[PDB]
């Protein structure tokens, strides 16, 4: 059945352009309106544009007014969205959504839309002037307790993701991997930790397996006492 | 803009009891006997699926325990008995006037038995101290409820603005959360003060717990 | 190379309207051939200046 | 049109109304001005959009269509194959011409109705404080400043607050 | 001191959805169905007069096939040719069988 | 409807009215009650009736119908035999689909119209004794018991009896 | 009809108005007389004109029509020839019987509207100086001569001139 599939986001410096594409399938695309709705990181839903089936009424939410332009190709069944003059505030994942109402008549700015019927994959658009750095994997030293625990702080990398595992994936239970956080430098860091039995803080050696595909970086640290 | 206000913010109920959420509109979103309001579920790392439309019809796929209700200006979503595949944010939306607007979102977690954290502090790594700046770390392990609070103290000077944190999702076996915290300083200021400590205060701690190292 | 459901001998035509006037010969799910070359359905009110 | 609102008792249309389809131009102490009434404007648009979609849901996906041109003169069978088609086309057109007509007649009568409906709804809301001027303008009989006015536009106007003033302006 | 009188109309707990010119679906207090969509399952023998051919085709009946001579001289309003039916005599063809049945 | 009484200024219809389609509700000194209006009910039903009867005096009493199912693949004649029925059946649907949809939008707007009619029979009775609240409700301005408003219901209301009282309650 | 003036709140019609279709009948200090209102008698006749004209041009001109009566029994090709025409015929007959039924209902309702239109044209002119009795008759509340009746009917009445005179007769 219905299926929307978004395309072509990523890293993009401020003031410069980019254009997304949603490739619809499984319904009569040409007889329905389409929307773009974005979502700040770990925040909420904003509405961005609508474009009628006609292709001839289009309205934008004020934040993206007149930088963005919502465009539509009812022959090739696919919805576009030009993002000129981007900036920080625009960082979000971007979603195409299908209008519920059939051959809607968006004769005006305020007229009522339909509900959002099906949504797309989603596509991430990052807007920063940082160019790529790589992860700087430091360990975290054991101590006292009942059973203590040890990890790997991964400082200054860009952009996400970074992906960890413990001892080639041979250790999984007790592992926690904390969502990243953007330092004011613009580079992300994350934390990753595992609690373990104390009765092998010497014998059981502990390699943590970091990766950052966007710089081609691979590290492997070890985790020891003292 | 019509302001959609959702309430309450976070929820939490015992897996198999009732949960309930409110969407409050900036003005009537009812018109010719239709209530132009819809409700969306959003689990993480994913888009939203449509839960309810026209205030109270279930979208084909949804199971019979979800229910929209209300008319005009107050509406109320209802999970009659919260199975555990419900933990998501829940967003209400109006589409009666462009710009369509959304509620802020109501995260619903699982209520469980209280759970103290387990606190570990870490000093900055020998590899790091070679390149200028210095990082301390604090780890709160499998605790519950979500609302813990770390406070850094450089020689008992409550710290602020240099520290960041993040938390994990709710776990799919214990339902505790878990928190990491990163006090970043320069090596400049690391070498002045000797006693580093993070003071966790939390429901399962009858009084604040402080974990600390000395530098050597 | 192009999508299009409705074939005439004059070429393809789209089926978004309910009535064609291109050719009574028609393969595919095509609007019905009517004699008139134009029929306008009013979508607004009466105009008065 | 059936109701006499548009194209009739309302002299002509306002060419400077771009926000919507139905409106309020006024005059009081705080100058003049215009504003579009949406609850109406949608109401009509709905009905049109609605019949629009009713009108278009069909495409004659019917089987093997016979041969309709012919290379040679044949007789009885060829003759019937033309007559059948000729006759089909003549009806389909009759249908086609009648649909546009009834629909369009209705579309007009419908937009007329909505005007009148607004104008009634308002007069009611104004219980005993104005009089129908005749041309689809009122004469509010007190001092109603731009504050008060919008109340009447978006429904909130409480008539009792004024009455005293307006009863006296009317019959004294 | 003074009264209020109010006019109004009735409603039901479950109207029927009908179609209109403007609206696909819209609920009214009551409907009625214009399309017959069901059959008793059996042909009635009144008021038309029905002749049940059984294992004879009407053409055979006419031609006079042995197991069809039951039918000589019969008269029908509607002749009901059964799919169970056969022929059983010199093998024949009738060009424009089509028409000779009709 | 087009008149915007039903589902218009008449907020919503009445489920506690089992003896009639349109009718009356009072509140007054003595108590509060409800009665149907029988003429305007009968009015509406008496149309919807004839309408129905009209929609139905047809059933194709013609006439030696042709073969429509098939034992063989035959080409030309067979093709036309199918085109001729396949076509008829397409038209006769359109016919049906149009019919209900007109019939129905009228059947609706007509009953809306009757609710207006009753409303204008009643205003004109209360010449200067009442005012339109705006929600299908009249404020009379005089004391009116269960025998009084019974007059109004059964059309036997004199307005000059009460005039002097009502006027004085309204304007003073 | 829908608007319920004709065969409605206007008891019946004037068999002795012979210069028009809608009009006025007075009783004043100077006696008793009558006049047609032309504007409305024109616009009611002008739609019916168009309508008729629309219903008419329309005549089936094609094309070597097939034979329709038959002097042999031929079975199948004939059986079709008849059923093609037999079917066509039933279609047009329906096609027709609908048109007339539709048109009329409307012709009847538009002529009704025109009356109610002229009723409300008057009402708005006599702004405060009269009151609707509900039998399609006003009761003007002042002294009005043949020159003032004829001034109402030709659009040139001046509510303000007989204003004060009007209110005393109503209220005191
Ligand atoms: C409005 O009128 C319609 C018909 O015009 C009403 O529907 C009718 O309901 C009755 C009683 O329930 C039905 O009678 C019988 O129904 C059962 C099957 O459930 C069976 O014993 C018989 O087959 C028999 O027909 C009837 O089917 C049905 N209409 C007609 C035309 O026969 C309806 O009750 C009314 N609407 C409301 C809201 O009351
Ligand atoms: C489509 O092609 C056909 C093929 O000829 C055209 O039909 C004829 O058109 C010409 C030009 O107007 C006339 O001389 C004939 O009278 C037509 N014949 C018939 C039987 O209708 C037709 O014009 C083409 N139409 C379009 C829109 O391209
Ligand atoms: C009436 O009987 C006819 C058969 O003569 C039915 O038409 C068949 O229906 C099935 C199932 O819907 C289809 O696969 C075909 O279109 C038909 N079969 C054949 C062999 O032609 C029809 O469905 C029956 N309907 C009722 C209401 O009794
Ligand atoms: C309609 O209702 C009225 C009032 O309810 C009825 O009037 C009768 O006569 C007097 C005159 O107003 C009333 O007080 C009584 O209630 C009625 N008495 C009798 C003996 O009938 C009357 O029933 C109805 N009107 C007409 C003209 O029949
Ligand atoms: C329409 O008819 C009226 C009513 O009779 C006419 O009234 C005349 O009007 C003028 C002033 O405008 C006066 O001299 C007289 O009172 C009337 N003359 C006659 C002979 O009756 C009038 O001609 C028309 N109205 C207008 C505004 O022209
Ligand atoms: C109508 O709009 C104005 C502000 O432009 C104000 O009088 C009032 O808040 C509004 N009324 C309603 C019911 O929203």
Q: Is F75 in a helix, a strand, or coil?
A: coil
E28: preceding bond cis by omega (within 30 degrees): no
**Residue G78: exposure state from Cβ atoms within 10 A (0-12, 13-18, ≥19):** middle
Q: How far is the CA of D152 from the centre of ligand 6 (A)?
A: 9
Q: Using what technique was this structure determined?
A: X-ray
| Cα F21 to Cα F114: distance, rounded to the nearest angstrom | 10
Residue A11: name the closest of A102, A167, A169, A123 by CA: A123
| Cα A188 to Cα A158: distance, rounded to the nearest angstrom | 6
Whether the CB of D103 is below 8 Å from some CB of chain F: the reply is no
Which superfamily is assigned to A1-129 in CATH?
Immunoglobulins (2.60.40.10)
Residue A61: name the closest of A74, A52, A70 by CA: A70
| Cα D36 to Cα D26: distance, rounded to the nearest angstrom | 12
> Tokens standing for D58?
């069909």
Contact G13, G27 (CB under 8 A): no
- Helix (H) / strand (E) element for D78: namely helix D76-125
Ligand 1 atom closest to residue E29's alpha carbon, by position in its atom list:
38
Does ligand 4 have an atom closer than 6 angstroms to the CB of F131?
no
Contact G95, D91 (CB under 8 A): yes
Tell me the CA end-to-end span of chain C in Å, nearest whole number: 48
E55: preceding bond cis by omega (within 30 degrees): no
Interchain proximity B50–A189, CB inside 8 Å:
no
Other chains touching G, judged by 3 or more CB pairs under 8 Å? D, E, F
Parallel, antiparallel, or unpaired: how do β-strands A175-182 and A188-195 relate? antiparallel
Residue E4: name the closest of F24, D157, F4, D167 by CA: F24
CB atoms within 10 A of CB G31: 8
> Tokens standing for G64?
């070597």
Does ligand 4 have an atom closer than 6 angstroms to the CB of F153?
no
CB atoms within 10 A of CB G89: 13
The DSSP 8-state label assigned to residue E95 in this structure reads T
Name which of D82, D134, D170 is nearest G125 (Cβ-Cβ): D134
Q: Which ligand is nearest to the CA of C35?
A: 2
Q: Is B80 in a helix, a strand, or coil?
A: coil
Of the options 3.20.20.120, 3.40.50.300, 3.40.1000.10, 2.60.40.10, the CATH number for the domain spanning A130-226: 2.60.40.10
| Cα F145 to Cα D76: distance, rounded to the nearest angstrom | 84
Crossing angle between the packed helical segments D38-54 and D76-125, to the nearest 10 degrees: 170
Interface of A with C in 46-75 (CB under 8 A): 75
- Residue F113 makes CB contacts below 8 A (sequence gap 6+) with F1, F2, F3, G2, G3, G4
CB atoms within 10 A of CB A9: 18
Residue ranges with strand state E in B59-208:
66-67, 74-79, 89-94, 101-102, 118-122, 133-143, 152-154, 163-167, 177-186, 195-200
**CA nearest to E9 within chain F:** F22
**Number of domain units in chain D:** 1
- Conformation bin of residue A124: beta by default, left when phi > 0, alpha when psi is -120 to 50: beta
Residue D149: name the closest of D44, D34, D42, D47 by CA: D34
| Cα G51 to Cα D159: distance, rounded to the nearest angstrom | 46
> Tokens standing for F67?
């073969």
> Tokens standing for G35?
């006049």
Task: Report angle CA A53, A56, A60 to the nearest 5 degrees.
Answer: 95
Task: Report angle CA E59, E63, E66 to the nearest 5 degrees.
Answer: 105
The DSSP 8-state label assigned to residue D134 in this structure reads S
Does ligand 3 have an atom closer than 6 angstroms to the CB of E40?
no
Residue the block writes with tokens 């240099």:
B162
Residue A73: name the closest of A21, A38, A17, A36 by CA: A21
Other chains touching B, judged by 3 or more CB pairs under 8 Å? A, D
Parallel, antiparallel, or unpaired: how do β-strands F130-132 and F32-37 relate? unpaired
Q: Identical fold at B1-111 and B112-216?
A: yes
For chain C, what's the residue count? 49
| Cα C49 to Cα D10: distance, rounded to the nearest angstrom | 11
The DSSP 8-state label assigned to residue F10 in this structure reads B
Ligand 5 atom closest to residue G146's alpha carbon, by position in its atom list:
5
- Helix (H) / strand (E) element for F25: namely strand F22-27
Q: Which CATH class is domain B1-111?
A: mainly beta
* Residue from E30, E33, E37 whose mutation best tests the ligand 1 pocket (most atoms within 8 A of CB): E30
| Cα F47 to Cα B167: distance, rounded to the nearest angstrom | 71
The DSSP 8-state label assigned to residue E14 in this structure reads S
Q: Which ligand is nearest to the CA of E32?
A: 1
Whether the CB of E3 is below 8 Å from some CB of chain F: the reply is yes
Does ligand 2 have an atom closer than 6 angstroms to the CB of C6?
no
| Cα A50 to Cα A61: distance, rounded to the nearest angstrom | 9
Contact D3, D109 (CB under 8 A): yes
DSSP secondary structure of G114-127: HHHHHHHHHHHHTT
Q: How far is the CA of E81 from the centre of ligand 3 (A)?
A: 18
Residue D143: name the closest of D23, D24, D30 by CA: D30
**CA nearest to F111 within chain G:** G2
Whether the CB of A135 is below 8 Å from some CB of chain B: the reply is no
| Cα D62 to Cα F86: distance, rounded to the nearest angstrom | 7
Contact B72, A120 (CB under 8 A): no
Q: How far, in Å, are D9, D11, D148, D172 from residue D138 at the CA level?
A: 13, 14, 15, 19
Q: Is E48 in a helix, a strand, or coil?
A: coil
User: What is the 3-state secondary structure of chain A?
Assistant: CCECCCCCCEECCCCCCCEEEEECECCCHHHEEEEEEEECCCCCEEEEEEECCCCCCEEECHHHCCCEEEEEECCCCEEEEEECCCCHHHCEEEEEEEEEEECCCCCCCCCCCCCEEEECCCEEEECCCCCCCCCEEEEECCCCCCCCEEEEEEEEECCCCCCCCECCCCECCCEEEEEEEECCCCCEEEEEEEECCHHHCCCCCCEEEEEECCCCEEEEEECCCC
Cβ density class E51-90: b for 16+ within 10 Å, e for less? eebeebbbbbbebebeebeebeeeeeeebebeeeeebeee
* Residue from E12, E31, E34 whose mutation best tests the ligand 1 pocket (most atoms within 8 A of CB): E31
Does ligand 5 have an atom closer than 6 angstroms to the CB of G91?
no
Residue C24: name the closest of D73, G88, F83 by CA: F83
CA torsion sign for G112, G116, G121, G125 is positive
B and C touching (3 or more beta-carbon pairs closer than 8 Å): no
Residue ranges with strand state E in B32-132:
37-42, 49-53, 57-58, 66-67, 74-79, 89-94, 101-102, 118-122
CB atoms within 10 A of CB D156: 10
How far G77 CA lies from chain E's nearest CA (Å)?
9
Parallel, antiparallel, or unpaired: how do β-strands A10-11 and A123-126 relate? parallel
Collect contacts of F93-97 with beta carbons under 8 A, ≥24 apart: F94/D58, F94/D95, F95/G91, F95/G94, F96/E34, F96/E35, F97/E19
> Tokens standing for A167?
């001892």
Q: How many CA atoms lie within 13 A of A9 on its CB side?
A: 21
Contact A92, A39 (CB under 8 A): yes
Q: Is F156 in a helix, a strand, or coil?
A: coil
| Cα B4 to Cα A211: distance, rounded to the nearest angstrom | 41
How far E54 CA lies from chain D's nearest CA (Å)?
34
CA G133 to chain centre: 23
Interchain proximity D48–A103, CB inside 8 Å:
no
- The domain spans of chain B are 1-111, 112-216
Could you tell me the residue range of the domain that residue D8 belongs to? Answer: 1-172
Name which of D45, D53, D56 is nearest A107 (Cβ-Cβ): D45
Q: How far is the CA of F154 from the centre of ligand 4 (A)?
A: 9
| Cα G39 to Cα G153: distance, rounded to the nearest angstrom | 11
- Residue G172 makes CB contacts below 8 A (sequence gap 6+) with none
| Cα D136 to Cα A183: distance, rounded to the nearest angstrom | 65
**CA nearest to F89 within chain D:** D62
Q: Which CATH class is domain B112-216?
A: mainly beta
Residue the block writes with tokens 């009757």:
F114
Interchain proximity D65–C16, CB inside 8 Å:
no
CA torsion sign for D112, D115, D118, D120 is negative
Contact A104, A52 (CB under 8 A): yes
C and G touching (3 or more beta-carbon pairs closer than 8 Å): no
| Cα G133 to Cα G138: distance, rounded to the nearest angstrom | 6
Query: Which of D87, D108, D119 to mutate to test binding with chain G, by most G CBs within 10 Å of its CB?
Result: D87
* Residue from C7, C10, C36 whose mutation best tests the ligand 2 pocket (most atoms within 8 A of CB): C10
For chain F, what's the residue count? 172
C and E touching (3 or more beta-carbon pairs closer than 8 Å): no
The DSSP 8-state label assigned to residue E85 in this structure reads -
Does ligand 3 have an atom closer than 6 angstroms to the CB of E36?
no
Residue C43: name the closest of D21, D40, A144 by CA: D21
| Cα B142 to Cα B172: distance, rounded to the nearest angstrom | 12
Contact F107, F51 (CB under 8 A): yes
Residue D61: name the closest of F94, C3, C28 by CA: C28
Whether the CB of G91 is below 8 Å from some CB of chain D: the reply is yes
Contact C15, D56 (CB under 8 A): no
Residue the block writes with tokens 């039901």:
E12
Question: Which residues pair with residue D115 across a beta bridge?
Answer: none
Contact F126, G134 (CB under 8 A): no
Residue F139: name the closest of F128, F151, F150 by CA: F128
Contact D44, D111 (CB under 8 A): yes
Residue B152: name the closest of B187, B119, B114, B116 by CA: B119
CB atoms within 10 A of CB A171: 17
Contact B165, B179 (CB under 8 A): yes
Residue B94: name the closest of B46, B47, B53 by CA: B53
For chain A, what's the residue count? 226
- Helix (H) / strand (E) element for F76: namely helix F76-125
CA torsion sign for C6, C10, C16, C19 is negative
Residue the block writes with tokens 């490739």:
A23
Q: Is B49 in a helix, a strand, or coil?
A: strand
Q: Which ligand is nearest to the CA of E39?
A: 3
| Chain pair D-F, CB pairs under 8 angstroms | 60
Using an 8 Å CB-CB cutoff, list chain G residues near E100: 75
Task: Report angle CA E33, E34, E40 to the nearest 5 degrees.
Answer: 80
Question: Which residues pair with residue A78 across a beta bridge?
Answer: A23, A73
> Tokens standing for D50?
């609605």
Other chains touching A, judged by 3 or more CB pairs under 8 Å? B, C, D
Using an 8 Å CB-CB cutoff, list chain B residues near A176: 141, 168, 178, 180
Q: Is E79 in a helix, a strand, or coil?
A: strand
| Cα E29 to Cα E16: distance, rounded to the nearest angstrom | 6
| Cα A178 to Cα A192: distance, rounded to the nearest angstrom | 6
Q: How far is the CA of D146 from the centre of ligand 6 (A)?
A: 11
Task: Report angle CA D74, D77, D78 to the nearest 5 degrees.
Answer: 55
> Tokens standing for A221?
């640290």
| Cα A27 to Cα D96: distance, rounded to the nearest angstrom | 28
| Cα A194 to Cα A179: distance, rounded to the nearest angstrom | 15
Instruction: Assign residue D76 the CATH number of its domain.
Output: 3.90.20.10
Contact B51, B37 (CB under 8 A): no
Residue D83: name the closest of C24, F83, G85, C22 by CA: G85
Q: How far is the CA of A101 from the centre of ligand 5 (A)?
A: 59
| Cα B186 to Cα B184: distance, rounded to the nearest angstrom | 7
SS3 content of chain E, % helix, strand, coil (to 5): 15, 20, 65
């Amino acid at each position: 059945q219905v299926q929307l599939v978004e395309s072509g986001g990523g890293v993009v410096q401020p003031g410069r352009s980019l254009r997304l594409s949603c490739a619809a399938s499984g319904f009569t695309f040409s007889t329905y309106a389409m929307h773009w709705v974005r979502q700040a990181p770990g925040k909420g839903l904003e509405w961005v544009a609508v474009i009628s089936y006609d292709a001839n009424y289009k309205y934008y939410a004020d934040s993206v007014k007149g930088r963005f332009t919502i465009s539509r190709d009812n022959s090739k069944n696919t919805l576009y969205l030009q993002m000129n003059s981007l900036r920080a505030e625009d960082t979000a994942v971007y979603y195409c959504a299908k209008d519920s109402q059939l051959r809607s008549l968006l004769y005006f700015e305020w007229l009522s839309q339909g509900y959002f019927d099906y949504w797309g994959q989603g596509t991430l658009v990052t807007v920063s002037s940082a160019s790529t750095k790589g992860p700087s994997v430091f360990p975290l030293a054991p101590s006292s307790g009942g059973t203590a625990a040890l990890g790997c702080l991964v400082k200054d990398y860009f952009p996400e993701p970074v992906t960890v595992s413990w001892n080639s994936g041979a250790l999984t239970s007790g592992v926690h991997t904390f969502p990243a956080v953007l330092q004011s430098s613009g580079l992300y860091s994350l934390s990753s930790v595992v609690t373990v039995p104390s009765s092998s803080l010497g014998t059981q050696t502990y390699i943590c397996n970091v990766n950052h595909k966007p710089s081609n970086t691979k590290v492997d640290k070890r985790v020891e006492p003292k | 803009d019509i302001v959609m206000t959702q309430s309450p913010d976070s929820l939490a109920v015992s897996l198999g009891e009732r949960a309930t959420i409110n969407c409050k509109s900036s003005q009537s979103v009812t018109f010719n006997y239709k209530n132009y309001l819809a409700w969306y579920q959003q689990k993480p790392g994913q888009p939203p699926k449509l839960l309810i439309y026209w205030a109270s019809t279930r979208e084909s796929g949804v199971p019979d325990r979800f229910s929209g209700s209300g008319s005009g200006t107050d509406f109320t979503l209802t999970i009659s008995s919260l199975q555990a595949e419900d933990v998501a944010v829940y967003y209400c939306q109006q589409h009666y006037r462009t710009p369509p607007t959304f509620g802020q979102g109501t995260k619903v977690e699982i209520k469980r038995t209280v759970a103290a954290p387990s606190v570990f502090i870490f000093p900055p790594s020998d590899e790091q101290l070679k390149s200028g700046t210095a990082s301390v770390v604090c780890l709160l392990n499998n605790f519950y409820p979500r609302e813990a609070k770390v406070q850094w103290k450089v020689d008992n000077a409550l710290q602020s603005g240099n520290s960041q944190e993040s938390v994990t999702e709710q776990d799919s076996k214990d339902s505790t959360y878990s928190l990491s915290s990163t006090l970043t300083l320069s090596k400049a200021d690391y070498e002045k003060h000797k006693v580093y400590a993070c003071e966790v205060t939390h429901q399962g701690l009858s009084s604040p717990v402080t974990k600390s190292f000395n530098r050597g | 190379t192009c999508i299009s459901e409705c074939i005439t001998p004059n070429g393809s035509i789209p089926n978004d309207k309910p009535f064609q006037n291109v050719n009574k010969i028609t393969y595919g799910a095509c609007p019905k051939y009517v004699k008139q070359n134009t029929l306008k359905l009013a979508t607004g009110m009466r105009n008065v200046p | 049109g059936l109701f006499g609102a548009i194209a009739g008792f309302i002299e002509n249309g306002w060419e400077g109304m771009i926000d919507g389809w139905y409106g309020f131009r006024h005059q009081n102490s705080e100058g003049t001005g215009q504003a579009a009434d949406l609850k109406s404007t949608q109401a009509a648009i709905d009905q049109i959009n609605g019949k629009l979609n009713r009108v278009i849901e069909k495409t004659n996906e019917k089987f093997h269509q016979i041969e309709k041109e012919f290379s040679e003169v044949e007789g009885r069978i060829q003759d019937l194959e033309k007559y059948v088609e000729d006759t089909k086309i003549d009806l389909w057109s009759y249908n086609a011409e009648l649909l546009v007509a009834l629909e369009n007649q209705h579309t007009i009568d419908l937009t007329d109705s909505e005007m009148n409906k607004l104008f009634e709804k308002t007069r009611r809301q104004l219980r005993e404080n104005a009089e129908e001027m005749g041309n689809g303008c009122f004469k509010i009989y007190h001092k109603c400043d731009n504050a008060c006015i919008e109340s009447i536009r978006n429904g909130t106007y409480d008539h009792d607050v004024y009455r005293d003033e307006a009863l006296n302006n009317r019959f004294q | 001191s003074t009264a209020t009188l109010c006019l109004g109309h009735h409603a039901v707990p479950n109207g029927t959805l009908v179609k209109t010119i403007t609206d696909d679906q819209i609920e009214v207090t009551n409907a009625t169905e214009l399309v017959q969509s069901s059959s008793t399952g059996k042909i009635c023998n009144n008021p038309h007069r029905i002749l049940d051919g059984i294992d004879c085709t009407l053409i055979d009946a006419l031609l006079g096939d042995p197991h069809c001579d039951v039918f000589q001289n019969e008269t029908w309003d509607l002749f009901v040719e059964r799919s169970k039916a056969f022929s059983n005599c010199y093998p024949y063809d009738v060009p424009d069988y089509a028409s000779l049945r009709s």
